[PDB]
Structure 1
Amino acid sequence: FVQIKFDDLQFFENCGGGSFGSVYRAKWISQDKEVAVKKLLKIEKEAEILSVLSHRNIIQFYGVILEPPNYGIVTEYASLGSLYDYINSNRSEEMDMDHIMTWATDVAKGMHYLHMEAPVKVIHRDLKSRNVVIAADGVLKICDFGASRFHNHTTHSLVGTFPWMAPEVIQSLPVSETCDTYSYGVVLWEMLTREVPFKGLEGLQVAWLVVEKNERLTIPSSCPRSFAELLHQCWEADAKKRPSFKQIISILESMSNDTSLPDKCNSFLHNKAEWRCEIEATLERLKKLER
């Protein structure tokens, strides 16, 4: 349990309003390192075992702040920001089939480690594109994987979470690991369409569309079948019909050994000026149904 001192830190920026669960961009002075700092109410003994998880697709624990009553967890800071901000910018014009497959695989391998390879089983329950960050070399790193057990303040408005939540999560029902599979499917759709999920709709309308009407994100017709099949499998209302992350990794492996997919996918990606209306027409229908 390496301890980082308050006096060894300079804070530059905060996400979440300084509340418990807020995350700071900061500088670890003695290490001359940029770091992220999450404020916690308290360090619970159970979550100390999170300090030993380590994987290249998971954000790396650096240490804890214990200066009572102030408590915090310090991690690496991924230089290129959140996946969500990258996707909804002009920076993501460069995404192609190979880019999507590498990043899909990054998140799958991170989640597989969390579910099956760490000293404890970890079910994220809040996986989303704001919770994946991009390291300097483009490696994706999952954040906030321990909040569902520990920091119940990073969990909790919640509007910007409902599009990523499995139906059983929205219903506060008991949860298996495939709730993360559902969230992953949404992240995959964001990489394929470069669209904000359910853009324009309020979170609670999304919650009702997803749980009651079995609504899902629109998959454009020209999206290659391999991606549509994986997405539909991840979005099954029945949690047990969803694939494990080992299965997703296997499926991504098959897809990358399909020599026809790169042409199919890359033609789909630079044809957004055509299928974008399909997304916009569903969004019209959903808010018209609301009215």
Structure 2
Amino acid sequence: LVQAVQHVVIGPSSLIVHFNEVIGRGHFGCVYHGTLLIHCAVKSLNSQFLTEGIIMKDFSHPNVLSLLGICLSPLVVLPYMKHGDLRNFIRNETHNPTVKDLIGFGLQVAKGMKYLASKKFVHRDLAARNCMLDEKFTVKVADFGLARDMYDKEYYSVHTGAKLPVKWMALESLQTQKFTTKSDVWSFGVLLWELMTRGAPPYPDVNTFDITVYLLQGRRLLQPEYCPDPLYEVMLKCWHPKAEMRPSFSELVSRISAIFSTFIG
């Protein structure tokens, strides 16, 4: 059996978990502050989940959340992310990110997704709520592999039994329930829109499963007030009806780099 957990196991003598310090919550379990013998986040789980998520051990990229290990109700040990999720970060009105900052965040997400696409890995739930910020404000694509969960149940709906983030899903995934790198690209465009609105909910006048017909009618998210025309063009390409006509993440990194660079920090 693929218990490659073996290589990833943190012995019981190497992890102190602080169960009184809940720093997060998912459908599968809580996240606790821990001490790895460094600071860390420790996600509780409550076979197929582990085997399908354990690939993340091989991943290392600055804009992708890494795995520190598994301790054994097994515990997934992840890097501490001081500034929480990206969506809450930008909704905090005590801080005013610049437009350059916000595009910067999307550029970092694009870089993380470029890496994951180059490893032939499909995220399936890319969204601002699922990216995390560390102490240096580096954005990490998260909520995948052993970190995979629903961290905000408002935005997931059932339909097979799966809980689907319908307002981030590509048109073909809404029809077929199948995901691909190119459906991640669709989601990426929605995340960009989230960034430019500082975390407004998409399609707020559309009841969850009325989204499919809305998109079939030839309709899309409207251009945010602070979103520059070239970036809205990127968003619209990301939501092309034909998957293969959507840009690659490599093209997105390049084009968003250019747009980012035209702004004053």
> Is the alpha carbon distance of 1:40 and 1:61 closer, same or farther for their aligned partners in structure 2, counting shifts above 3 Å?
farther
1:234 counterpart (233, 238, 242): 238
Unpaired runs of 5+ residues, structure 2, are 1-6, 157-164
> Is the alpha carbon distance of 1:105 and 1:159 closer, same or farther for their aligned partners in structure 2, counting shifts above 3 Å?
closer
Query: When the two structures are superposed, what TM-score results if normalisation uses the length of structure 2?
Result: 0.80
> Is the alpha carbon distance of 1:38 and 1:209 closer, same or farther for their aligned partners in structure 2, counting shifts above 3 Å?
farther
1:204-253 per-residue CA deviation (whole Å, 9 max, x = no partner) reads 2334423x334321114774221111111011122111100001011123
Residue 61 of structure 2 is aligned to residue 55 of structure 1: yes
Alignment match, 2:18: 10
Separation in 2, partners of 1:256, 1:129: 18
1:56-108 per-residue CA deviation (whole Å, 9 max, x = no partner) reads 11112111022xxx12321112110111112222045x222321232121100
Separation in 2, partners of 1:122, 1:26: 28
Residue 165 of structure 2 is aligned to residue 159 of structure 1: no
Quick check: 1:125–1:169 contact (8 Å CA) kept in 2? no
Quick check: 2:31–2:42 contact (8 Å CA) kept in 1? yes
Alignment match, 2:254: 250
Quick check: 2:183–2:243 contact (8 Å CA) kept in 1? yes
Separation in 1, partners of 2:77, 2:37: 13
1:106 counterpart (87, 105, 108): 108
RMSD of the TM alignment (CA)? 2.9
Separation in 2, partners of 1:81, 1:200: 28
1:123-144 per-residue CA deviation (whole Å, 9 max, x = no partner) reads 1111011100111111101112
Alignment match, 2:210: 205
- Aligned-pair CA distance for 1:38: 4.4
Structure number with greater Rg is: 1
Separation in 2, partners of 1:96, 1:222: 10
- Aligned residues with identical type, % of pairs: 26
Quick check: 1:134–1:140 contact (8 Å CA) kept in 2? yes
Q: Which letter does structure 2 place at the counterpart of 1:143?
A: A
Separation in 2, partners of 1:190, 1:154: 18
Query: When the two structures are superposed, what TM-score results if normalisation uses the length of structure 1?
Result: 0.73
Q: Between Structure 1 and Structure 2, how many residues are aligned? A: 246
Quick check: 1:159–1:202 contact (8 Å CA) kept in 2? no
2:187 counterpart (166, 183, 194): 183
2:201 counterpart (196, 201, 223): 196
- Aligned-pair CA distance for 1:146: 2.6
Alignment match, 1:31: 37
Quick check: 1:2–1:64 contact (8 Å CA) kept in 2? yes
Separation in 1, partners of 2:154, 2:85: 18
> Is the alpha carbon distance of 1:31 and 1:198 closer, same or farther for their aligned partners in structure 2, counting shifts above 3 Å?
farther
Q: Which letter does structure 2 place at the counterpart of 1:198?
A: Y
> Is the alpha carbon distance of 1:224 and 1:53 closer, same or farther for their aligned partners in structure 2, counting shifts above 3 Å?
same
- Aligned-pair CA distance for 1:26: 2.4
Quick check: 2:132–2:141 contact (8 Å CA) kept in 1? yes
> Is the alpha carbon distance of 1:43 and 1:169 closer, same or farther for their aligned partners in structure 2, counting shifts above 3 Å?
closer
Alignment match, 1:86: 89
Quick check: 2:25–2:151 contact (8 Å CA) kept in 1? no
Alignment match, 2:159: none
- Aligned-pair CA distance for 1:175: 3.2
Alignment match, 2:124: 125
Alignment match, 1:262: 263
2:175 counterpart (171, 174, 183): 171
